[PDB]
Symmetry: C3
Subunit: 333 residues, 3 copies
C-alpha cells in the first residue's frame, strides 16, 4: 500500500495519568497517527524527604504519555532531542516489529530529531522505552519509559466475545529508581551524568530499588491528584513497568476483567484480586465501581507500596450500598 494515500491524524498528548482523546471502536479506516515527543532531562524530587534525581523523560513526565492507536494503524513518531539535553537517546516500542523496536533507527544526539514509522500489527497495551546501546537500564530506570495502547478496531471484548466499554481510562506508570547510597545508607549526590554512571550501575546491580513510585513521585496520585470515579462507572486502568515485576491491586475493589500481560486477543482473567505484570510489560484492568469512598491502588508487595512509594488513591462519588457491605456493630468496648 501507498501509505501516502491514507488519512493522517495528529495527536496532541496529555500528561499521565490522563490519556488523550480517542475512540474505542474505530470510526475510520486505518490511519497514520502522528505523534511528537520532546525528550527532557530534568531534576525531579521523588519523595517526601526531598530526594532529587536527574530524570530522563519523554515529554517532561515520568512515565511518558500514553499513546493510543488502533490495530493496523501506522504510528509515526517525531522524536526531538533538544540541544539543552546532554545525552544520546532513542526509542524502542514493544508494539513494533524490527530494528530492536525502533531503537536501532532513532538514535538522536542533543540537537537532533528523527521520525520513525511502524505498523501497529498487534492489539494490546505495550511498553515503550529508551534503549541506547550499552546504557539501557540506566535510561529506563531514570524514568525514560511509557506505554502505547493498540486497540482492536472493534474495541475491547470480554471472555465471551461481548463488548466491554470503559467510561474513563487512566495510565499508571510504575517506576523503580536506584538512587546510589553510601555505606551508611544515605543517598549520594553527583555532579555530571558521567561521574554518576558507575555508582548508578552499582546501585542497579543490588536489584533493590530505593523508590518505587506511581506517576513519578511518592504521593503523586493522592490528594488533589487522586484518581476519580463515580459509582457505576466503568474504568480501565493501564499499568506499566518497564523493568521490574509488579502486582497491582485495587484496595476495596477488584479487576473485573484483567489482561495481566496486556494483549487483547486473549480473553481477560475475571475477578482478580491481584495480578502480576512482569517487568517489561503493560497490563490493563477493567472495573465497574460499586461503592463510593477512598480506594488505594497499590503494588501489593505492601512494603513496596507503603514504604517505597507504589500507592495511589481513587476518590469515588455516589451512594453507599449496605447490602454489599455494612458495619453491623461499629467498634466499641
Amino acid at each position: 500500500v501507498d501509505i501516502s494515500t491514507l488519512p493522517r491524524v495528529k495527536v496532541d498528548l496529555v500528561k499521565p495519568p490522563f490519556v488523550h482523546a480517542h475512540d474505542q471502536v474505530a470510526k475510520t479506516g486505518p490511519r497514520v497517527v502522528e505523534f511528537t515527543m520532546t525528550i527532557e532531562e530534568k531534576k525531579l524530587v521523588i519523595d517526601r524527604e526531598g530526594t532529587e534525581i536527574h530524570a530522563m523523560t519523554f515529554n517532561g513526565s515520568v512515565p511518558g504519555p500514553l499513546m493510543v492507536v488502533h490495530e493496523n494503524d501506522y504510528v509515526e513518531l517525531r522524536l526531538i532531542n533538544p540541544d539543552t539535553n546532554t545525552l544520546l537517546h532513542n526509542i524502542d516500542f514493544h508494539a513494533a516489529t524490527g530494528a530492536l523496536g525502533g531503537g536501532a533507527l532513532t538514535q538522536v544526539n542533543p540537537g537532533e530529531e528523527t521520525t520513525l514509522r511502524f505498523k501497529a500489527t498487534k492489539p494490546g497495551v505495550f511498553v515503550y522505552h529508551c534503549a541506547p546501546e550499552g546504557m539501557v537500564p540506566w535510561h529506563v530506570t531514570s524514568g525514560m519509559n511509557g506505554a502505547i495502547m493498540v486497540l482492536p478496531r472493534d474495541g475491547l471484548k470480554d471472555e465471551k466475545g461481548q463488548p466491554l466499554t470503559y467510561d474513563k481510562i487512566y495510565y499508571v506508570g510504575e517506576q523503580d529508581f536506584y538512587v546510589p547510597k553510601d555505606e551508611a545508607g544515605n543517598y549520594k549526590k553527583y555532579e555530571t551524568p558521567g561521574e554518576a554512571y558507575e555508582d548508578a550501575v552499582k546501585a542497579m546491580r543490588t536489584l533493590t530499588p530505593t523508590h518505587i513510585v506511581f506517576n513519578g513521585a511518592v504521593g503523586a496520585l493522592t490528594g488533589d491528584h487522586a484518581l476519580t470515579a463515580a459509582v457505576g462507572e466503568r474504568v480501565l486502568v493501564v499499568h506499566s513497568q518497564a523493568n521490574r515485576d509488579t502486582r497491582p491491586h485495587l484496595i476495596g475493589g477488584h479487576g473485573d476483567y484483567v489482561w495481566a500481560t496486556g494483549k487483547f486477543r486473549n480473553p481477560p482473567d475475571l475477578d482478580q484480586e491481584t495480578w502480576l505484570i512482569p517487568g517489561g510489560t503493560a497490563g490493563a484492568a477493567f472495573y465497574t465501581f460499586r461503592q463510593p469512598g477512598v480506594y488505594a491502588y497499590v503494588n501489593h508487595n505492601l512494603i513496596e507500596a507503603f514504604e517505597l512509594g507504589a500507592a495511589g488513591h481513587f476518590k469515588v462519588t455516589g451512594e453507599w450500598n449496605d447490602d454489599l457491605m455494612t458495619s453491623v456493630v461499629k467498634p466499641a468496648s
Copy 2:
C-alpha cells in the same frame, strides 16, 4: 432484600492447614455465615535456631484460619481485640467490595470488638489481612493474614465445564518475615512494639526476607504435622501470600488443575509443574495422587524453600505404580 429473612449458620473455625467443614455444592440457598475471630499478639519461635518474634495473629495462628462460604452468601465477622493486646488492628477482605475491603470499618483498639458484614459476590480464594493506616506492611509481615474461599454454588469446574470434586483440602499460608539484623548479621531484639517499629521498617525496606515459612515456622508441615493423602485421592491445596510472590510446586507431582491467581470463574491451567501466586493473592491447585511416598511441597525458589523455610511434606499411602516410574538399575558401581 431483608437480610434478616435469610438463614444464619455459625462456623466454628479450625487451625491451618485444616479447614472447617463445608459443602462444595451449596445445599441451601444464600445464607449469612457467621464467623468470630479473636486477635492474639504472641511470641512465636519460627526456626530451628530458636528465633522468637512478636507475632500478630488472627485466632492464634499464622496464617489465620481459612473461612469458606459460597458465592452470594453474606460473611458476618465478629472481630475481637482483647485488652491483653497492645495494638490497634482491623481487617481487609480481598473478597469484599468497599471501605478498603472492610478495614475502614473495623478498627478495634485493645478492649474493643466490631461486627462487619459483606456480600461475597465473586467466587475464588482471596487473601484477608490486617491493614491499620500507616502500619500496613508491619502487621501483615508479622503474620496477620489468612484467606477466604468463596465457592461457586455448584462447586468447582474444569476447563470444559465438568465437575471437579476434592476429597481433601488443605490451606498453606506462606509468610515472609523480616527480622531486623545488626551489621554483623545477627537478629536484634526489641522490648516494646514501638521501640521495634523503626528497625522493622528498615528491615522490610531491604525487600529480603530473613524467613519464609509455611504454617508459621520452619518445618511446621513436616514430621507428625506432614500433610497426608492416599493414592487416588483428589486434594485441593489453597496457598496464600499476602505480601510477596511465591511459586508453589509439588515435588514428585503436579497441579493437575490450577487457578494460580485463585478465581474460579476462569478455567484452570492444566498440568502445571510450578505456578506463580503474586504477592497479595490466594491460589488453588487440584491434584489426584498417583504414587505413594514422601512428597515435598515447596516454593520453587529452592533457596527460599530449603534455606529460608518454605517447604512442607506430604506422606502418601498406597500402592507403587512401576509403570509410571521405576528404578530399572538401582545405583551401583
Copy 3:
C-alpha cells in the same frame, strides 16, 4: 503393559542451545526413549572479567541438554557419575510422577551409575535438576539443571485447535549464580566444595544473584554463537529457570504464541511482549520472524539482562519490510 514389547529408540543428545532431532507429530506408537547423561563437575569461566566457578553439570554444559519425547512415551535415563567427580548427585524430573521426580531413586556417588524409567504422562516443557537431600539449591544454582519437552502426539496447537509447526527450535537455559563476596564486594575463592559450602549458603541467602546468564556465561549466545533465523521462519524458543523467576522478551519481536508456564494442553497466550516464567518452570514461545537484522533476547529486568548477563542475540537474514517499520527521517540536526 509389558514395556519390553515396546520399541526402543536411543537418543544422542546435543549441546544447548541446539536440540536433538525429533518429530513434532509422532511417527510411531509409544516408545521407550533411551537417554544417557554423564555428570561432570568442572571449572567454568562465567563472565568477561574471568570469574571462574566450580560448576556442576549434566553432560558438560550449563544448562544440561534438552531431552524430547512424546506424551506417553517412557523416558529411560542412564545417569553416570564418574569417579573423577567428588560429590553425590541425582535427578528430579518435573515431568515425572513419584519419588520426588526421580531423585529418591537416582542417588549416585562418584563411581556409580543408575537407570531410571518414567512414563511421560503430561505434555509440556519441564525442568529437570539435581536435588540431593539437604544440598538442593547449591547443586541447582551451580548449574545442575536442564529441561525436557514432552510433545503432544499430534504436535502443537494454537488457541483454536489448528496446528502450529516450528521450523527451528532453540533451548535457552537461564542460570542464577551466587558467587560469594567478601565485605568489599570481591568474589571469594575456595579450595574444596566442603570449604565452599557455608559461604555458598550465605551467598544464596542474600537472594541476590551475582550473575544471571544464558547458556552458561555472559555473552554465550552472541557473536559466532548468536541464534539464527530467516525472515518467515517459525521458531520455538524453550526457556527454563530452575530456581528464580524470569521474564523473557524478544527485542524487536514478540511471542506470537506463548505457553509461559510451559504446558501444552492449555491454549497459548497470544501476542506477548514479555511473559513470566516462574522459578522452577520451563516455558515456550513461538514466533514467526518478519524482519531481518539483529535482535536481542533478554530477561526484561534490564539490569539482569545487560548488567548481570541475561541477554543473547538472534541474527536474522532476509528482506526488510518498510511497510512494517521504516525511518521516515533519519536522525539529523
